[PDB]
């Protein structure tokens, strides 16, 4: 059992979703998300006559304001019985210390913990901006469908009508489809991040390959983001006007591993779409009596006396991240 302050990572490397589209964090002192409580977009046009001023403007009463945040509280043991991750030859005598082994093993345990919540949050993000629906579900828990409201024109499919696979691999240009799906996106699209084989049949067209610019032509901080997360986001290059990226991230589930992304999917939208990170109550007596009922995360190291007389690291959170405008992204399944 070590203090709360032993929670230093400086490792925030989420794959460009919770850090770039979903910056809009709202931890609450209350259980649910109350979209009426969030101001979101403000009623933002009307003025008043040059004699007096008008009424009082409020948070404009969101129609649906009741969903259950994913209160996730996992834990692990940091029992000093293992040989640990030994960074090359930094004096294993301190590993021989139970104190250093226990502290850096709580380091390792907790980092596994937040990357676990981060990967489940990224699955929530990919569900969110791929269908507008999120499955708040788990065993011994009712499945609540949390819908931002993704429209039908945001779910139009490439296989409908003519498929890119069922097209000329040399002369056909899918740019026409690119603006066709981008027009009904309530904004400009500046990233065309694909799943791998989706980008494969996208680039199979020649027009794509002599239309794209392999050069840097550094447009924004997206190159810096790729250099940071050189793991699963791949900056293919410029398609001229728009940036071409491929995400091949993978989640390692209970017995097997598989990619986050489905077979062939796309979301057309902006890099500055508004993403909410509403956070529920944290059900920990420590959190309430020290005021961490409204926060992002909560770690603790703590000893059980009695039957499971041991010591554990416990991580608690409650995210219900969504997208403010589901119509911002057009979600297309590809050929």
């Amino acid at each position: 059992a070590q203090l709360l302050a032993a929670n230093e990572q400086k490792f925030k490397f989420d794959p460009l979703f919770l850090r770039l589209f979903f910056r809009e964090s709202y931890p609450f002192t209350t259980e649910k998300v109350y979209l009426s409580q969030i101001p979101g977009l403000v009623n933002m046009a009307l003025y008043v006559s040059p004699i007096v001023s008008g009424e009082v403007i409020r948070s404009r009463g969101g129609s649906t304001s009741e969903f259950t945040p994913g209160y996730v509280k996992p834990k692990h043991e940091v029992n000093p019985q293992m040989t640990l991750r030994r960074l090359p030859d930094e004096d294993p005598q301190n590993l021989a210390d139970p104190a250093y082994r226990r502290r850096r093993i709580i380091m390792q345990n907790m980092r596994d913990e937040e990357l676990a919540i981060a990967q489940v949050e990224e699955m929530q993000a990919v569900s969110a901006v791929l269908k507008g629906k999120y499955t708040m579900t788990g065993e011994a828990f009712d499945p609540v469908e949390v819908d931002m409201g993704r429209s039908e024109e945001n779910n139009i499919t490439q296989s409908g009508g003519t498929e890119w696979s069922k097209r000329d691999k040399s002369t056909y240009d899918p740019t026409d489809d690119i603006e066709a799906y981008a027009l009904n996106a309530s904004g400009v699209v500046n990233i065309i991040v694909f799943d791998p084989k989706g980008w494969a049949l996208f680039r199979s067209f020649k027009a794509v390959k002599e239309k794209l610019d392999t050069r840097r032509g550094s447009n924004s901080e997206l190159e810096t983001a790729v250099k940071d997360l050189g793991k699963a986001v791949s900056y293919k290059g410029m398609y001229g006007d728009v940036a071409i990226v491929v995400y091949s991230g993978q989640y390692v589930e209970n017995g097997v591993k598989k990619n986050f992304l489905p077979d062939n999917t796309m979301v057309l939208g902006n890099t500055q779409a508004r993403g909410l990170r509403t956070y529920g109550c944290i059900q920990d007596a420590d959190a309430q009596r020290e005021g961490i009922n409204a926060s992002a995360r909560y770690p603790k190291n703590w000893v059980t006396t009695g039957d499971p007389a041991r010591e554990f690291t416990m991580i608690q959170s409650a995210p219900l991240m969504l997208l403010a405008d589901p119509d911002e992204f057009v979600s297309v399944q590809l050929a």
């Binding site: 005598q93 139970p98 104190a99």
Partner: peptide
């Protein structure tokens, strides 16, 4: 018993 109390091997200031 040396587990719950651990001296590093260094100058006293940087060891305390």
């Amino acid at each position: 018993q040396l587990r719950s109390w651990n001296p590093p091997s260094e100058s006293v200031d940087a060891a305390l």
